[PDB]
Amino acid sequence: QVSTVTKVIHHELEVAASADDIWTVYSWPGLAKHLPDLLPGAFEKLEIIGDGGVGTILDVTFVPGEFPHEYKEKFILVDNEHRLKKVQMIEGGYLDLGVTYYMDTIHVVPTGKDSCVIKSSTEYHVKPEFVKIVEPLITTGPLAAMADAISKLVLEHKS
Numbered sequence: 001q002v003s004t005v006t007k008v009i010h011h012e013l014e015v016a017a018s019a020d021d022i023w024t025v026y027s028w029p030g031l032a033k034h035l036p037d038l039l040p041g042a043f044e045k046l047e048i049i050g051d052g053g054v055g056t057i058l059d060v061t062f063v064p065g066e067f068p069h070e071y072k073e074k075f076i077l078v079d080n081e082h083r084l085k086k087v088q089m090i091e092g093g094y095l096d097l098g099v100t101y102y103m104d105t106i107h108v109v110p111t112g113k114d115s116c117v118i119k120s121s122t123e124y125h126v127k128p129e130f131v132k133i134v135e136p137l138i139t140t141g142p143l144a145a146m147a148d149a150i151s152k153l154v155l156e157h158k159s
């Protein structure tokens with residue numbers, strides 16, 4: 001049995017809003033329900049199972065054509081002290097393409113009174129034979145699109 005491969009991807013978005021202002025949205029139990037009210041064209045559908053807080057499960061279906069089709073995500077952790085959120089893919093998606101573990105992390109870091117950076121990362125463990133296949137497919141795209149969307153929600157509410 002040959003060693004599992006670990007891969008990390010990282011995206012950052014500078015924002016002219018305080019780390020609180022941006023954490024309040026990422027940590028908002030009602031963020032999940034707002035998601036099409038933020039990223040149209042992405043989702044065919046989005047079932048939510050729970051309160052919207054830690055332990056909530058998202059069933060996500062994308063518009064016919066593009067990969068993956070479906071998958072389920074679970075809110076694993078919110079830490080208001082560190083402004084750190086973790087979201088794990090628990091079923092479908094890449095997990096049917098030899099990925100044994102896929103975890104999104106969002107860290108909102110202060111850079112002075114009225115500004116912060118959104119540090120989004122993804123860590124995955126993949127069976128070494130599938131690395132050629134999945135490495136081109138797992139991109140920041142999803143977390144970049146969330147960082148952009150949240151950023152432009154907040155800058156319009158603060159302005």
Ligand SMILES: Oc1ccc(CCNCc2ccccc2)cc1O
Nearest residue numbers: 031039042058073087142143145146
């Ligand atoms: O912090 C979160 C991270 C992820 C989600 C669920 C959907 N995945 C992210 C996405 C965005 C855009 C196109 C596809 C997938 C909810 C969160 O609150």
